[PDB]
Design a protein around this ligand. Sequence first.
Ligand SMILES: [Cl-]
Ligand SMILES: [Cl-]
Ligand SMILES: [Cl-]
Ligand SMILES: [Cl-]
Lengths: 173, 173, 173, 173
Amino acid sequence: SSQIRQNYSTEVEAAVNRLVNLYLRASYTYLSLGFYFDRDDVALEGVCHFFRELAEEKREGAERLLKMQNQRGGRALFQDLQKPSQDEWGTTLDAMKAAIVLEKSLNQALLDLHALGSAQADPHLCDFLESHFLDEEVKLIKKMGDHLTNIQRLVGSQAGLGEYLFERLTLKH
Amino acid sequence: SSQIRQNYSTEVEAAVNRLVNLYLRASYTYLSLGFYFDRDDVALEGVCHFFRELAEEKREGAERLLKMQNQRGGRALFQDLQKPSQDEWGTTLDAMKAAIVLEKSLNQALLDLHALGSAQADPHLCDFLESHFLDEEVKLIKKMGDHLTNIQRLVGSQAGLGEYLFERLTLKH
Amino acid sequence: SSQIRQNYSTEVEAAVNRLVNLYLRASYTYLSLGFYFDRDDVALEGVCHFFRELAEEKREGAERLLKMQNQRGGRALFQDLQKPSQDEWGTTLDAMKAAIVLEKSLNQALLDLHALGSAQADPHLCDFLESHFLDEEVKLIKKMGDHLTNIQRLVGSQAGLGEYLFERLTLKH
Amino acid sequence: SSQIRQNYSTEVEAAVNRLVNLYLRASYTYLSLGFYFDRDDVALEGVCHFFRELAEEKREGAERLLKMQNQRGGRALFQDLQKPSQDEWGTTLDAMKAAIVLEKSLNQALLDLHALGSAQADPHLCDFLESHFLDEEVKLIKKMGDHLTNIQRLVGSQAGLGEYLFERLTLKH
Ligand SMILES: [Cl-]
Ligand SMILES: [Cl-]
Ligand SMILES: [Cl-]
Ligand SMILES: [Cl-]
């Protein structure tokens, strides 16, 4: 057992393990989104790349949380990773909307954990979220909102054309 | 006559000469496709470049097969090269569909020859196809399928615009 | 739907999706093993690093399989990822034994899929496994067997000492 | 007197001076630990180096606190520095246990001051601790816990051997 644990509640420890599960599920969802856009009958490379990069970012978030859990003397505990909510993800617009919903749910989980840390007077936890998660999440959601607006303006009456142009001229490929 | 030939059936030798003919015909077809898209009344440079590059790749496939034929102690035999099936190739979409049909026929010829090699217990032949042809063909067909989907999404109700944009923003020029 | 699919059976497609699940589960198991050895009350950095590297390798194997699925015109389908079989992994010896068992199960899944590919006359699938998985797996299992033998010789009557020395002098840190 | 002081309570000012005393005492304790392990009849250079480095780190922590005190318009006040609690520090294990106890007491002092800063609505103080002390302290305690576990596993039935090996193969020398 730990000889280091100090000011680290069982409630926070458990919530950290739940958040790890949420980040890994998000990673898995992004893996599925990425491979959908790589299908020969979808074929939007920039969109594929965007979601593959997010799968990696979310995995890295989970790893940082697990590292912190150990640094504090908590015990990492893993649960089943539920499959993503969809097998096919529709249009780029459908996918970017689903991504924003996912990100808002993760952001709310971060905020909930920050509030728990504040209530438990755990400033290391609070600082850790502030320093590595909260601003990164606000930036990502701003970026997704920006994309969504551009996708929306391009639908118009020529949806295929707009979907191609967004992928070619906004997303990295 | 050969002093080297070993485990190399007459059936395989003949099939290799037929495949050489098929690759050279494919090369010739791609030469014609390339020069069609270079016409002043077609003028799609990226499309021209794509097919010219494929003419070269298919010629190189034929040369590798002829080199292998000699390495095994078979006898290269050449036949008439039939002219391509069309003198004019329609739209970029028409051309990319015709290319996928051609590639599937070549892929089936590779698979047929692999099966013959397996039946004849000729592992060098089988390995040679695996190492230099089968994956290259799967990759090319994936690429063509990706292009076809993008061309298709761009037709919409403004076909000229979409054909220009695909050439400008997807194909190398 | 796919315009590219050729010689790619539904049986192989399904088996590829199952193998992806197996690789991702293996990745998850290695993630858990790695974080266990990072605990302050275990504290074997070289062992942690070894398993973290394997988590990454297994994820990359899954990604290669998913890429290939798309190249062939199959449909990636994801299932629930079961949690690892243990929450605590015992000694370095216990962990390396569990890793070898896992690797043998993955190797058997690769062999089973190769046999299915041979029966279905799918040489691209067979080549793909040969080129990227089968030798990599044999090498890894040889390496694990080598480690296991060294761990075993070091138990003797001073288990702590031997566990420390293996981590310090064999594993990268 | 200060023309700059703003939102900086007398309670915080006093607690900052006490924390400076605690950091300087910790520095002094580490100086003594370092020179003990440099004795010809102890002679564990890696252990000496570890504690000498910590003496320097704790002095630097004190200096940062004194700099901040001035930046806020508080008045640095120094008290007697009590000698360390021991003149001889036993084994490496005894020393690393004593170091962890010391570090936990410093960590609790940081947490107490953070709580005081929160209660007094002094966000600069709170941020200052978060940014320069709280994570540094968690990392150091994790490192000490890791060392303690390795020292403990090496005692076994050959204590001298284990103490030598830890110093040679874990600590920098
Ligand atoms: Cl379960
Ligand atoms: Cl003739
Ligand atoms: Cl389900
Ligand atoms: Cl005095």
